[model samples]
Target: MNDRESLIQALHHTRDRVKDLVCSLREDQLSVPYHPGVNPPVWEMGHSTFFYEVFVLNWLDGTPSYDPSMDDLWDSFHMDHEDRWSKTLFPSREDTLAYMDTIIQRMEDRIRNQPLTDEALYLYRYAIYHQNMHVESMTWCRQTVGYPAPPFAEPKGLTGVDQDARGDATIPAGRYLIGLPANRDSDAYATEDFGFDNEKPAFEVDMPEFSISRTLVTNGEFQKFVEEGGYERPEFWSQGGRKWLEREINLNFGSGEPPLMGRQTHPFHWRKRDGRWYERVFDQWLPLEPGHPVKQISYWEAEAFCAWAGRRLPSEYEWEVAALANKPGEERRRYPWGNEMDPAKLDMDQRYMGRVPVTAFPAGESPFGCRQMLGTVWEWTGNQFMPYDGFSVDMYPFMSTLQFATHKTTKGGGCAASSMLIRGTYRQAYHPDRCDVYTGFRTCALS
Candidate 1:
């Protein structure tokens, strides 16, 4: 399939995945977030549709949905993370989900007949991927809200496996490109189309050859740092991290001792009792799934954990090289196993819902023999989220500048990541102290 055709096909699969995930849940489950601003199921369904309608139809197609008032009603610009539920006049769950269905149906038909212009194609990808992101996020939020897990549309169970620490993952010292190519003004990707600007500039950076862990830092590996009081230790933390931990991370213990819920453990979802830790995987909790990626950790926390364990965070370049080997334009491969998206090759199927054992994807290994380098966990990188040299913000100006303060770059997309949003060059970042998103870290050798 050509690029446009490939995109439409991807959307079909992604949309199918989203519907299956939400359909399994009960109505009450959607409104379960503690914070009012937290999205209720009623709101998220509409909001996700609104995201597509606004970006693709309205922004790109020069069309509008309903009235200007509804535009403001669905506008996410004026809202904060904690204010979505209480302030917004949310629609009924049934009504909102219906609206979602209508918009998606309209979009599917619209694109099918219209042979999307390059701009529309870009917008279509952006909008579809944006909705896909929300689907992953909203579903994950169901877990944080303590709702029952969603059912699997396809119940192909996953195996918990053991992958040895990666030996070939280390790259020898050499100058490497850092960000996007410095003089990238390619007309190939529709520069002024519906794409976000942060993907531009495409500057180059000189990265020294550094070794990365073949596989992500496993649950057992991260446990070593925590057992040594990694969170409690001051010496290992950056000044900012130490401050956050002392004030917050160091505190916040969850319910019960043996069955801890709110404790400042290795991860937010990990339960430790009888000198062993178990992680909550979707609906059921399992014994600390050893060899699983260590998740729910912020950049700072991951950094500190690495310091305590005599390791360090990989740079964006190191990871890209490890993932892509020595391919230039091809470095943009979506999957770590080389370009195609597959669960059998990558471990994130809806059946698993959450993270599985780190060694799950041997086929997912890069040229460096790095196991699980691609999926399962969103690995934290040392690189800050920056624009690619001369990036312009014609589309989605909201995404730029915002990332400078609140985000950092992560490579090799996570298990829960959508293919659209997982562009190799597309920068992904969150707060350094954010341990959200089944996020984990692997060490890179300074040499």
Candidate 2:
């Protein structure tokens, strides 16, 4: 298919996903309580739809908006997180859905008939990716609010094996080029491979011989840390981790309230009952799968785990080298397996509502025999989120630049991440304290 057909297909797929995620919610569920980590569901739907209206329709084609008040209602930049909770600020569910439908129809029409200029293709691709991101956010929002899992296809023929490939992949020392090279033109969007600004201006860096875990750190591994007083031990935690722990305890128990006895030290969604651990998956609580890669882990927690286990998180560059390149001088592949994305090789795009076993997806192993490098849970890296060399502002200025230094860098995509949006080199940023999203970590030997 040509560029326009490909774009039109993506546009339709994303819109259907957005509707499927939110359309089943009741009014109260739609207007969920305020969360610092997520936008209100109704607002999220409208805002994602309005992205096409603003960027593709208004900016690209100079078409007028269907609603005069769209800018006020759906502009995420102008509105505060708290403002999205206001009842009067957004339209009713019916009206919001209508607006979404109209915008999607308009967008499809434009992509089908309009000329596929470099600028047009870039904007269309950007809008689709932006919506694709929100699709994941919408899935997490359900989990955050204790809503039912979004209706998605079930995984077929998954393994019951608890562990697979229980060893580390030793990578040789070499120079590796990291990140995608920037477009030759001054305009950032005028490129075939549309990477975000932070991923541009590819530069080479030296890497030392390092051995990284073949699979992510499993819940069984983390359970050992928790049971052995991981949270109680301050020596394992950094200064930031300690502060976060203190604040968490205070928030859970409130000011001056006596602490409950035997309060479990575990992830946000975890509960210990009858000497058995259970994890909340959306509205259902199920037995904790020990072999699954632990999700919703903060960088601080991962760091603490590393400290306790005599391991260290791999640097972002090391992760890139492992995922993209196999041998020292070999050409990089778009994914661990290759350029094409095979859903059977990994869990992504919500194929499974939550994570599968860490040992799963042997076929998706990297060139150096690292398994599941592209999907499952996003693996946290040791480095902070920073720009590559020669980084420049793209059309979406605030996407990556603002988070530099403040957020932690996570490689690979999570279970709900769109395959189109995530690749070997994709850099996902989250605050070190954010445990709300689907994130986990693997470790490197102390080297």
Give the number of the best model, judged by TM-score.
2
lDDT of each: 0.63, 0.80
lDDT of 2 at 236: 95
**Candidate 1 regions with alpha-carbon error over 4 angstroms:** 1-9, 20-23, 35-38, 153-157, 175-184, 190-196, 248-265, 326-335
Model 2 CA lDDT for position 441: 89
Q: Residue-wise lDDT of candidate 1 within 118-196, one digit each (tens)? A: 6677677777777776766765665555555556422123555674545546576554433333223444463221235
Listed per model in order, the count of residue pairs whose N, CA or C atoms clash below 3 Å is 29, 0
Name model 2 segments beyond 4 Å from true.
Answer: 153-159, 185-192, 249-264, 326-330
Model 1 lDDT at residue 259: 33
Give the Å shift of residue 235 in candidate 1: 1.8
